[PDB]
């Protein structure tokens, strides 16, 4: 059942776009937003779907709503208000510039050095998985690589055993996409019931893990509370078991169908850092938003307090006004223009671990396993959300193409 239209919204901006069922879904769950960038479609639109909300269709308009953060807040980013109200993650839901000490702590809970602490562990684990798969001609990559590679790095970084993985990979996904079982409030309170005997354990005995940096950070003249250690852990926990796992999945949902894009990285290994950056332009899996904090003037219209706007990453990523060659793919980037880390005050503070993980994966797959596709019969079903997903990724290859490394 679509919403009524508010009294302050005029009909010429109406598009009844649905966030969780995007209108051109069969193109890929980032390209399936591209229809919003047709010529007749303004820079700003409103929909009646999902309780009714603005959508910013272009990279400039998106970034101009990350730059007026003093009017556009992340205290509610989830366009389903029942999940936006429940949300409270750190740094992101705290107001800058007085956020500053929470994010400085984040940037020493995870930073370029931590990638140097796990890099050989990254390496040998991509090597040992991709040696285990090398001659096997098939796998379901969402489960035979993408979930157990980075999660067995993030768990070991945080100091948690492997045996909680399907219980935390259950909860993360229940927060990030609407399955139906748990609300965000439910899945969050269940996460926190599980993690606060662990954060308390990190107060009783600190250790060489990241949660023992989260729990003992000093901020605004005081300790970081459990109230706030649990909320900063929720972010990281969405970070290392959903954004980097689904991104991995999408990256091969492209190289699967792409014989030349694979060859380009075989002839020239020095495109592998630039191909991740274009993969982060292209397969920018996120559908973020923000709430209006005052009544405010935008794009020729007045917006009201308690209004919510979607600012989709892939509508910077694909936009002809930002990015040269945006539907076609090539890896020769010197520069690129997109929001798959946010903007201005917000900046992804974890994804440099995933950069070296994907780039290890890229450089150590295209050797052992150079030529490959998705299983025949298999159709890939894509899941839209505040972070987007897929159902399952069954890859195939001939054992006789494959190289011992
Ligand atoms: C490649 C996969 C990932 C992508 C696509 C991604 C995307 C993003 C985006 C778009 C932001 C800003 C959101 C906002 O404006 O509120 C963000 C925030 C953040 N990310 Fe990532 N990220 C990824 C992986 C990770 C990893 C693996 C971690 C965990 C170590 C992580 C932790 C963070 C942190 C701590 C923030 C908060 C930054 C802030 O407050 O400015 N991210 N990331
Ligand atoms: C983890 C995210 C980057 C994703 C979009 C904004 C964010 C902070 C969320 O809460 C979901
Ligand atoms: K267009
Ligand atoms: K500003
Ligand atoms: K298997
Ligand atoms: K699994």
Tab-separated table of C-alpha atoms and ligand atoms in Angstrom:
chain	number	residue	atom	x	y	z
A	1	UNK	CA	0.000	0.000	0.000
A	2	UNK	CA	1.661	3.288	-1.193
A	3	UNK	CA	1.629	6.362	1.194
A	4	UNK	CA	-0.541	9.477	0.927
A	5	UNK	CA	1.393	12.499	-0.494
A	6	UNK	CA	2.394	15.245	1.955
A	7	UNK	CA	0.835	18.817	1.730
A	8	UNK	CA	4.206	20.377	0.883
A	9	UNK	CA	5.072	18.037	-2.184
A	10	UNK	CA	3.971	19.029	-5.748
A	11	UNK	CA	3.187	16.311	-8.249
A	12	UNK	CA	5.751	17.049	-11.070
A	13	UNK	CA	8.600	15.543	-8.854
A	14	UNK	CA	6.560	12.254	-8.175
A	15	UNK	CA	8.242	8.902	-9.130
A	16	UNK	CA	6.821	5.889	-7.166
A	17	UNK	CA	10.240	4.240	-6.771
A	18	UNK	CA	10.540	1.387	-4.243
A	19	UNK	CA	13.799	1.214	-2.288
A	20	UNK	CA	13.704	-2.633	-1.547
A	21	UNK	CA	12.141	-3.556	-4.945
A	22	UNK	CA	14.086	-1.200	-7.373
A	23	UNK	CA	12.452	-0.627	-10.750
A	24	UNK	CA	15.178	-1.975	-13.245
A	25	UNK	CA	16.372	-4.877	-10.893
A	26	UNK	CA	17.463	-7.224	-13.793
A	27	UNK	CA	20.461	-4.978	-14.705
A	28	UNK	CA	22.257	-5.527	-11.306
A	29	UNK	CA	21.263	-4.101	-7.873
A	30	UNK	CA	23.454	-0.931	-8.444
A	31	UNK	CA	22.587	-0.452	-12.149
A	32	UNK	CA	18.804	-0.989	-11.258
A	33	UNK	CA	18.753	2.627	-9.889
A	34	UNK	CA	20.073	4.096	-13.155
A	35	UNK	CA	16.575	4.724	-14.500
A	36	UNK	CA	16.315	7.562	-11.908
A	37	UNK	CA	18.874	9.442	-14.013
A	38	UNK	CA	16.738	9.716	-17.184
A	39	UNK	CA	16.483	13.191	-18.751
A	40	UNK	CA	12.925	14.022	-17.669
A	41	UNK	CA	13.758	12.977	-14.030
A	42	UNK	CA	14.830	15.979	-11.890
A	43	UNK	CA	17.881	16.172	-9.573
A	44	UNK	CA	15.429	15.700	-6.625
A	45	UNK	CA	12.481	13.300	-6.671
A	46	UNK	CA	9.875	12.111	-4.109
A	47	UNK	CA	8.267	8.619	-3.860
A	48	UNK	CA	5.140	7.237	-2.162
A	49	UNK	CA	6.884	3.923	-1.524
A	50	UNK	CA	8.518	2.883	1.773
A	51	UNK	CA	6.462	5.420	3.776
A	52	UNK	CA	7.245	8.194	1.290
A	53	UNK	CA	10.705	10.010	1.143
A	54	UNK	CA	12.823	12.242	-1.089
A	55	UNK	CA	15.515	10.626	-3.319
A	56	UNK	CA	18.432	12.703	-4.653
A	57	UNK	CA	19.093	11.305	-8.188
A	58	UNK	CA	22.543	12.948	-8.872
A	59	UNK	CA	26.141	13.001	-7.318
A	60	UNK	CA	26.154	16.829	-6.848
A	61	UNK	CA	22.739	16.918	-5.105
A	62	UNK	CA	23.783	13.873	-3.029
A	63	UNK	CA	27.039	15.504	-1.922
A	64	UNK	CA	25.354	18.906	-1.284
A	65	UNK	CA	23.104	16.848	1.254
A	66	UNK	CA	26.280	15.434	2.900
A	67	UNK	CA	27.805	19.012	3.104
A	68	UNK	CA	24.760	20.599	4.824
A	69	UNK	CA	25.073	17.903	7.527
A	70	UNK	CA	23.938	20.707	9.999
A	71	UNK	CA	20.529	20.420	8.242
A	72	UNK	CA	20.620	16.699	6.943
A	73	UNK	CA	21.322	14.337	9.869
A	74	UNK	CA	22.474	10.668	10.155
A	75	UNK	CA	20.703	10.298	13.527
A	76	UNK	CA	18.066	8.509	11.321
A	77	UNK	CA	19.630	7.094	7.965
A	78	UNK	CA	17.207	4.158	7.514
A	79	UNK	CA	14.253	5.245	5.246
A	80	UNK	CA	12.008	2.587	7.110
A	81	UNK	CA	11.419	4.706	10.205
A	82	UNK	CA	10.828	1.560	12.478
A	83	UNK	CA	14.503	0.761	11.660
A	84	UNK	CA	15.676	4.496	11.588
A	85	UNK	CA	14.360	5.075	15.079
A	86	UNK	CA	16.117	1.990	16.447
A	87	UNK	CA	19.490	3.013	14.994
A	88	UNK	CA	22.302	4.739	17.020
A	89	UNK	CA	25.705	3.596	15.675
A	90	UNK	CA	29.065	5.380	16.348
A	91	UNK	CA	30.808	7.519	14.941
A	92	UNK	CA	27.978	8.071	12.416
A	93	UNK	CA	24.793	8.946	14.555
A	94	UNK	CA	26.863	11.377	16.729
A	95	UNK	CA	27.011	15.053	15.753
A	96	UNK	CA	30.324	16.589	14.555
A	97	UNK	CA	32.501	18.451	15.053
A	98	UNK	CA	32.111	17.218	18.677
A	99	UNK	CA	32.158	13.590	17.312
A	100	UNK	CA	35.881	14.059	16.856
A	101	UNK	CA	37.273	11.808	19.648
A	102	UNK	CA	34.988	8.812	18.783
A	103	UNK	CA	36.254	8.823	15.202
A	104	UNK	CA	40.031	9.355	16.269
A	105	UNK	CA	39.476	6.180	18.435
A	106	UNK	CA	37.852	4.389	15.342
A	107	UNK	CA	40.872	5.426	13.211
A	108	UNK	CA	43.125	3.612	15.795
A	109	UNK	CA	40.659	0.621	16.226
A	110	UNK	CA	41.028	0.200	12.473
A	111	UNK	CA	43.577	1.983	10.211
A	112	UNK	CA	46.394	1.357	7.433
A	113	UNK	CA	48.707	-0.284	10.208
A	114	UNK	CA	46.089	-3.010	11.078
A	115	UNK	CA	46.175	-3.971	7.440
A	116	UNK	CA	49.929	-4.539	8.004
A	117	UNK	CA	49.135	-6.800	11.064
A	118	UNK	CA	46.833	-9.053	9.116
A	119	UNK	CA	48.312	-8.726	5.535
A	120	UNK	CA	50.332	-11.938	5.618
A	121	UNK	CA	47.212	-13.645	7.301
A	122	UNK	CA	45.116	-12.173	4.406
A	123	UNK	CA	47.640	-13.450	1.898
A	124	UNK	CA	48.160	-17.002	3.210
A	125	UNK	CA	44.346	-17.396	3.781
A	126	UNK	CA	43.405	-16.190	0.177
A	127	UNK	CA	46.332	-18.511	-0.992
A	128	UNK	CA	45.087	-21.490	1.180
A	129	UNK	CA	41.441	-21.128	0.254
A	130	UNK	CA	42.193	-20.537	-3.461
A	131	UNK	CA	44.670	-23.504	-3.359
A	132	UNK	CA	41.904	-25.621	-1.744
A	133	UNK	CA	39.480	-24.543	-4.683
A	134	UNK	CA	42.047	-24.299	-7.536
A	135	UNK	CA	41.474	-27.588	-9.481
A	136	UNK	CA	37.806	-28.052	-8.255
A	137	UNK	CA	35.945	-26.369	-11.126
A	138	UNK	CA	33.123	-24.956	-9.030
A	139	UNK	CA	32.105	-23.474	-5.687
A	140	UNK	CA	29.295	-21.385	-4.284
A	141	UNK	CA	31.541	-18.313	-3.696
A	142	UNK	CA	29.180	-16.499	-1.146
A	143	UNK	CA	29.887	-19.431	1.215
A	144	UNK	CA	33.130	-21.142	-0.088
A	145	UNK	CA	35.209	-17.826	-0.052
A	146	UNK	CA	33.436	-14.416	0.478
A	147	UNK	CA	31.893	-15.147	3.866
A	148	UNK	CA	34.698	-17.247	5.475
A	149	UNK	CA	37.741	-15.156	4.140
A	150	UNK	CA	37.223	-11.643	5.537
A	151	UNK	CA	35.080	-12.852	8.576
A	152	UNK	CA	38.060	-15.120	9.682
A	153	UNK	CA	40.159	-11.768	9.628
A	154	UNK	CA	37.633	-9.437	11.308
A	155	UNK	CA	36.976	-12.141	14.127
A	156	UNK	CA	40.632	-12.661	14.685
A	157	UNK	CA	41.090	-8.739	14.637
A	158	UNK	CA	38.358	-8.295	17.257
A	159	UNK	CA	39.376	-11.373	19.222
A	160	UNK	CA	36.238	-13.518	18.838
A	161	UNK	CA	36.144	-17.263	18.115
A	162	UNK	CA	34.934	-18.720	14.640
A	163	UNK	CA	32.004	-20.480	16.266
A	164	UNK	CA	29.997	-17.262	16.614
A	165	UNK	CA	30.206	-16.542	12.823
A	166	UNK	CA	26.793	-17.865	11.668
A	167	UNK	CA	25.189	-16.328	14.712
A	168	UNK	CA	26.743	-12.844	13.944
A	169	UNK	CA	26.322	-13.326	10.154
A	170	UNK	CA	22.740	-14.068	10.973
A	171	UNK	CA	22.226	-10.847	13.012
A	172	UNK	CA	24.150	-8.531	10.592
A	173	UNK	CA	22.052	-9.452	7.646
A	174	UNK	CA	18.836	-9.138	9.837
A	175	UNK	CA	19.961	-5.566	10.555
A	176	UNK	CA	21.148	-4.669	6.965
A	177	UNK	CA	18.219	-6.289	4.973
A	178	UNK	CA	14.613	-7.048	5.814
A	179	UNK	CA	14.224	-10.830	5.802
A	180	UNK	CA	11.163	-10.735	8.216
A	181	UNK	CA	12.336	-12.613	11.273
A	182	UNK	CA	13.919	-9.763	13.459
A	183	UNK	CA	13.472	-6.107	13.438
A	184	UNK	CA	16.579	-3.853	13.679
A	185	UNK	CA	15.695	-3.236	17.297
A	186	UNK	CA	15.452	-6.958	17.834
A	187	UNK	CA	18.611	-7.968	16.007
A	188	UNK	CA	20.510	-5.056	17.629
A	189	UNK	CA	19.354	-5.826	21.226
A	190	UNK	CA	20.255	-9.585	20.519
A	191	UNK	CA	23.768	-8.414	19.276
A	192	UNK	CA	24.291	-6.322	22.264
A	193	UNK	CA	23.184	-9.055	24.751
A	194	UNK	CA	25.942	-11.149	23.161
A	195	UNK	CA	28.663	-8.446	22.918
A	196	UNK	CA	28.391	-6.605	26.349
A	197	UNK	CA	29.707	-9.724	28.424
A	198	UNK	CA	32.575	-9.420	25.847
A	199	UNK	CA	33.016	-5.692	26.217
A	200	UNK	CA	32.860	-6.102	30.083
A	201	UNK	CA	35.596	-8.931	29.595
A	202	UNK	CA	37.636	-6.291	27.673
A	203	UNK	CA	37.224	-3.991	30.902
A	204	UNK	CA	38.112	-6.797	33.321
A	205	UNK	CA	41.077	-7.820	31.187
A	206	UNK	CA	42.055	-5.620	28.123
A	207	UNK	CA	44.060	-7.578	25.280
A	208	UNK	CA	45.724	-7.394	21.905
A	209	UNK	CA	42.291	-7.192	20.043
A	210	UNK	CA	40.311	-4.122	18.695
A	211	UNK	CA	37.321	-4.349	21.249
A	212	UNK	CA	39.932	-3.772	23.991
A	213	UNK	CA	40.772	-0.399	22.148
A	214	UNK	CA	36.911	0.307	21.805
A	215	UNK	CA	36.152	-0.206	25.500
A	216	UNK	CA	39.132	1.797	26.897
A	217	UNK	CA	39.171	4.931	24.617
A	218	UNK	CA	39.004	8.219	26.486
A	219	UNK	CA	36.600	10.795	24.958
A	220	UNK	CA	35.176	14.346	26.082
A	221	UNK	CA	37.134	14.236	29.402
A	222	UNK	CA	35.909	10.635	30.403
A	223	UNK	CA	35.856	6.889	29.592
A	224	UNK	CA	33.991	5.471	26.621
A	225	UNK	CA	30.900	3.816	28.245
A	226	UNK	CA	29.561	0.281	27.311
A	227	UNK	CA	26.510	2.170	25.955
A	228	UNK	CA	28.858	3.708	23.412
A	229	UNK	CA	31.337	0.708	22.967
A	230	UNK	CA	28.408	-1.473	21.852
A	231	UNK	CA	27.189	1.175	19.345
A	232	UNK	CA	30.630	1.706	17.817
A	233	UNK	CA	31.002	-2.103	17.601
A	234	UNK	CA	27.640	-2.352	15.680
A	235	UNK	CA	29.092	-0.288	12.793
A	236	UNK	CA	32.335	-2.403	12.499
A	237	UNK	CA	30.183	-5.516	12.751
A	238	UNK	CA	28.086	-4.384	9.767
A	239	UNK	CA	31.475	-3.439	8.195
A	240	UNK	CA	33.401	-6.726	8.290
A	241	UNK	CA	30.634	-9.328	7.872
A	242	UNK	CA	28.235	-7.582	5.439
A	243	UNK	CA	29.805	-4.577	3.374
A	244	UNK	CA	33.068	-6.462	2.618
A	245	UNK	CA	31.305	-9.911	2.128
A	246	UNK	CA	28.571	-8.650	-0.206
A	247	UNK	CA	31.213	-6.467	-2.084
A	248	UNK	CA	33.361	-9.526	-2.633
A	249	UNK	CA	30.211	-11.301	-3.977
A	250	UNK	CA	29.388	-8.441	-6.424
A	251	UNK	CA	33.003	-8.141	-7.654
A	252	UNK	CA	32.886	-11.766	-8.781
A	253	UNK	CA	29.192	-11.376	-10.111
A	254	UNK	CA	30.974	-9.096	-12.657
A	255	UNK	CA	34.303	-11.033	-13.309
A	256	UNK	CA	32.116	-14.173	-13.774
A	257	UNK	CA	30.619	-12.783	-16.877
A	258	UNK	CA	33.818	-10.848	-17.974
A	259	UNK	CA	36.563	-12.529	-19.937
A	260	UNK	CA	38.367	-9.300	-21.124
A	261	UNK	CA	38.180	-7.616	-17.583
A	262	UNK	CA	39.821	-10.763	-16.313
A	263	UNK	CA	42.470	-10.768	-19.086
A	264	UNK	CA	43.133	-6.954	-18.490
A	265	UNK	CA	44.384	-7.914	-14.959
A	266	UNK	CA	46.406	-10.893	-16.175
A	267	UNK	CA	48.364	-8.882	-18.855
A	268	UNK	CA	48.810	-6.038	-16.423
A	269	UNK	CA	48.804	-6.869	-12.555
A	270	UNK	CA	49.285	-3.067	-11.954
A	271	UNK	CA	45.600	-2.459	-12.858
A	272	UNK	CA	44.574	-4.529	-9.864
A	273	UNK	CA	44.598	-1.534	-7.376
A	274	UNK	CA	42.812	0.671	-10.048
A	275	UNK	CA	40.208	-2.141	-10.832
A	276	UNK	CA	39.203	-2.261	-7.130
A	277	UNK	CA	38.689	1.515	-7.130
A	278	UNK	CA	36.480	1.132	-10.305
A	279	UNK	CA	34.706	-1.864	-8.731
A	280	UNK	CA	34.029	0.555	-5.723
A	281	UNK	CA	32.666	3.069	-8.379
A	282	UNK	CA	30.559	0.475	-10.199
A	283	UNK	CA	29.317	-2.070	-7.576
A	284	UNK	CA	28.718	0.543	-4.823
A	285	UNK	CA	26.167	-1.697	-2.993
A	286	UNK	CA	24.734	0.967	-0.496
A	287	UNK	CA	21.450	2.933	-0.325
A	288	UNK	CA	22.086	5.497	2.482
A	289	UNK	CA	19.917	8.426	3.617
A	290	UNK	CA	19.584	11.287	6.190
A	291	UNK	CA	16.764	13.192	8.156
A	292	UNK	CA	15.982	16.999	7.883
A	293	UNK	CA	16.605	18.714	11.341
A	294	UNK	CA	14.903	22.115	10.482
A	295	UNK	CA	12.625	23.462	7.848
A	296	UNK	CA	14.958	24.125	4.955
A	297	UNK	CA	15.146	25.428	1.232
A	298	UNK	CA	16.259	22.913	-1.424
A	299	UNK	CA	16.089	22.634	-5.387
A	300	UNK	CA	13.286	25.241	-5.499
A	301	UNK	CA	11.074	23.851	-2.789
A	302	UNK	CA	10.832	24.140	0.981
A	303	UNK	CA	11.517	20.778	2.872
A	304	UNK	CA	10.171	20.250	6.447
A	305	UNK	CA	11.709	18.923	9.707
A	306	UNK	CA	11.307	15.087	10.050
A	307	UNK	CA	11.619	14.639	6.178
A	308	UNK	CA	13.967	11.847	5.054
A	309	UNK	CA	16.079	11.715	1.865
A	310	UNK	CA	17.812	8.796	0.163
A	311	UNK	CA	21.124	9.748	-1.324
A	312	UNK	CA	22.118	6.426	-3.185
A	313	UNK	CA	25.924	5.826	-3.530
A	314	UNK	CA	25.458	4.263	-7.129
A	315	UNK	CA	23.833	7.711	-8.205
A	316	UNK	CA	27.052	9.358	-7.630
A	317	UNK	CA	28.833	6.205	-8.998
A	318	UNK	CA	26.975	5.944	-12.359
A	319	UNK	CA	26.134	9.604	-12.987
A	320	UNK	CA	27.218	11.060	-16.291
A	321	UNK	CA	27.865	14.537	-14.649
A	322	UNK	CA	30.456	12.999	-12.171
A	323	UNK	CA	32.228	9.979	-13.839
A	324	UNK	CA	33.649	9.544	-17.288
A	325	UNK	CA	32.683	6.185	-18.958
A	326	UNK	CA	30.131	5.235	-16.158
A	327	UNK	CA	28.190	2.276	-17.637
A	328	UNK	CA	31.125	0.834	-19.647
A	329	UNK	CA	33.844	-0.547	-17.352
A	330	UNK	CA	37.615	0.076	-17.610
A	331	UNK	CA	40.384	-0.050	-15.054
A	332	UNK	CA	42.672	2.774	-16.197
A	333	UNK	CA	41.537	5.168	-13.449
A	334	UNK	CA	43.864	8.109	-12.440
A	335	UNK	CA	40.777	9.622	-10.726
A	336	UNK	CA	37.186	8.852	-9.974
A	337	UNK	CA	34.162	10.642	-8.395
A	338	UNK	CA	31.723	8.711	-5.971
A	339	UNK	CA	30.357	8.370	-2.443
A	340	UNK	CA	31.099	4.712	-1.583
A	341	UNK	CA	32.761	6.087	1.638
A	342	UNK	CA	30.455	9.134	2.203
A	343	UNK	CA	31.714	12.699	2.352
A	344	UNK	CA	33.092	15.782	4.196
A	345	UNK	CA	32.605	14.982	7.898
A	346	UNK	CA	31.878	11.192	7.299
A	347	UNK	CA	34.670	9.068	5.667
A	348	UNK	CA	34.850	5.304	5.670
A	349	UNK	CA	37.411	4.447	8.372
A	350	UNK	CA	37.560	0.564	7.868
A	351	UNK	CA	37.632	-0.171	4.078
A	352	UNK	CA	41.474	-0.126	3.585
A	353	UNK	CA	41.532	-3.730	5.176
A	354	UNK	CA	38.869	-4.820	2.474
A	355	UNK	CA	40.853	-2.903	-0.251
A	356	UNK	CA	44.028	-5.198	0.490
A	357	UNK	CA	41.695	-8.174	0.956
A	358	UNK	CA	40.013	-7.746	-2.470
A	359	UNK	CA	43.319	-6.862	-4.076
A	360	UNK	CA	44.946	-9.950	-2.588
A	361	UNK	CA	41.915	-11.996	-3.805
A	362	UNK	CA	42.083	-10.376	-7.276
A	363	UNK	CA	45.883	-11.068	-7.653
A	364	UNK	CA	45.784	-14.568	-6.207
A	365	UNK	CA	42.638	-15.799	-8.003
A	366	UNK	CA	43.615	-14.625	-11.563
A	367	UNK	CA	46.694	-16.932	-11.247
A	368	UNK	CA	45.311	-20.149	-9.835
A	369	UNK	CA	41.984	-19.574	-11.431
A	370	UNK	CA	42.234	-17.372	-14.539
A	371	UNK	CA	39.173	-18.339	-16.704
A	372	UNK	CA	35.707	-18.867	-15.115
A	373	UNK	CA	31.801	-18.209	-15.260
A	374	UNK	CA	28.566	-18.628	-13.179
A	375	UNK	CA	26.984	-22.133	-13.302
A	376	UNK	CA	24.550	-22.768	-16.300
A	377	UNK	CA	20.819	-22.656	-15.291
A	378	UNK	CA	21.762	-20.473	-12.320
A	379	UNK	CA	19.982	-17.017	-12.406
A	380	UNK	CA	21.434	-14.537	-9.738
A	381	UNK	CA	18.849	-12.799	-7.596
A	382	UNK	CA	19.878	-9.511	-6.136
A	383	UNK	CA	18.588	-7.930	-2.835
A	384	UNK	CA	18.203	-4.104	-2.461
A	385	UNK	CA	18.707	-2.377	0.937
A	386	UNK	CA	20.649	0.265	2.993
A	387	UNK	CA	23.409	-2.259	2.079
A	388	UNK	CA	22.432	-4.425	-0.939
A	389	UNK	CA	22.976	-8.230	-1.171
A	390	UNK	CA	22.640	-11.379	-3.394
A	391	UNK	CA	20.996	-14.861	-2.751
A	392	UNK	CA	23.945	-17.180	-3.871
A	393	UNK	CA	26.942	-17.200	-6.367
A	394	UNK	CA	27.702	-20.626	-7.937
A	395	UNK	CA	30.839	-20.200	-10.090
A	396	UNK	CA	32.205	-22.854	-12.568
A	397	UNK	CA	35.481	-23.468	-14.434
A	398	UNK	CA	37.430	-26.246	-16.049
A	399	UNK	CA	40.044	-27.928	-13.724
A	400	UNK	CA	42.386	-28.152	-16.849
A	401	UNK	CA	42.607	-24.271	-17.079
A	402	UNK	CA	43.939	-23.951	-13.567
A	403	UNK	CA	47.549	-23.251	-12.344
A	404	UNK	CA	49.436	-24.519	-9.313
A	405	UNK	CA	50.901	-21.500	-7.272
B	1	LIG	C1	34.377	-2.284	0.814
B	1	LIG	C2	33.339	-2.383	1.681
B	1	LIG	C3	32.830	-1.179	2.477
B	1	LIG	C4	32.148	-0.116	1.933
B	1	LIG	C5	31.567	-0.162	0.552
B	1	LIG	C6	31.957	0.858	2.992
B	1	LIG	C7	31.218	1.997	2.855
B	1	LIG	C8	31.219	3.034	3.798
B	1	LIG	C9	30.489	4.337	3.713
B	1	LIG	C10	29.674	4.686	2.522
B	1	LIG	C11	30.747	5.004	4.886
B	1	LIG	C12	30.099	6.341	5.322
B	1	LIG	C13	28.637	6.149	5.770
B	1	LIG	C14	28.011	7.421	6.283
B	1	LIG	O1	28.100	8.456	5.595
B	1	LIG	O2	27.400	7.497	7.388
B	1	LIG	C15	31.396	4.073	5.769
B	1	LIG	C16	31.598	4.263	7.139
B	1	LIG	C17	32.438	3.574	7.923
B	1	LIG	N1	33.040	2.408	7.553
B	1	LIG	FE1	33.026	1.617	5.735
B	1	LIG	N2	32.725	0.537	4.036
B	1	LIG	C18	33.183	-0.770	3.788
B	1	LIG	C19	33.928	-1.569	4.664
B	1	LIG	C20	34.214	-1.250	5.964
B	1	LIG	C21	34.975	-2.060	6.817
B	1	LIG	C22	35.501	-3.440	6.480
B	1	LIG	C23	34.801	-1.584	8.080
B	1	LIG	C24	35.215	-2.228	9.400
B	1	LIG	C25	36.507	-2.291	9.826
B	1	LIG	C26	34.206	-0.258	7.903
B	1	LIG	C27	33.992	0.636	8.957
B	1	LIG	C28	33.620	1.917	8.739
B	1	LIG	C29	33.633	2.923	9.793
B	1	LIG	C30	34.243	2.735	11.130
B	1	LIG	C31	32.785	3.919	9.277
B	1	LIG	C32	32.370	5.201	9.979
B	1	LIG	C33	33.072	6.464	9.315
B	1	LIG	C34	32.587	7.832	9.702
B	1	LIG	O3	31.945	7.988	10.776
B	1	LIG	O4	33.004	8.813	9.070
B	1	LIG	N3	33.878	-0.086	6.552
B	1	LIG	N4	31.922	3.014	4.985
B	2	LIG	C1	27.493	0.855	7.458
B	2	LIG	C2	26.893	1.934	6.586
B	2	LIG	C3	28.095	2.504	5.802
B	2	LIG	C4	25.625	1.607	5.767
B	2	LIG	C5	25.205	2.966	5.197
B	2	LIG	C6	25.470	3.931	6.321
B	2	LIG	C7	26.072	3.024	7.422
B	2	LIG	C8	26.809	3.848	8.533
B	2	LIG	C9	24.914	2.189	7.927
B	2	LIG	O1	24.415	2.293	9.081
B	2	LIG	C10	24.571	1.202	6.842
B	3	LIG	K1	21.149	9.173	-17.522
B	4	LIG	K1	28.366	23.167	4.496
B	5	LIG	K1	32.630	-27.036	-1.868
B	6	LIG	K1	27.886	-19.730	5.316
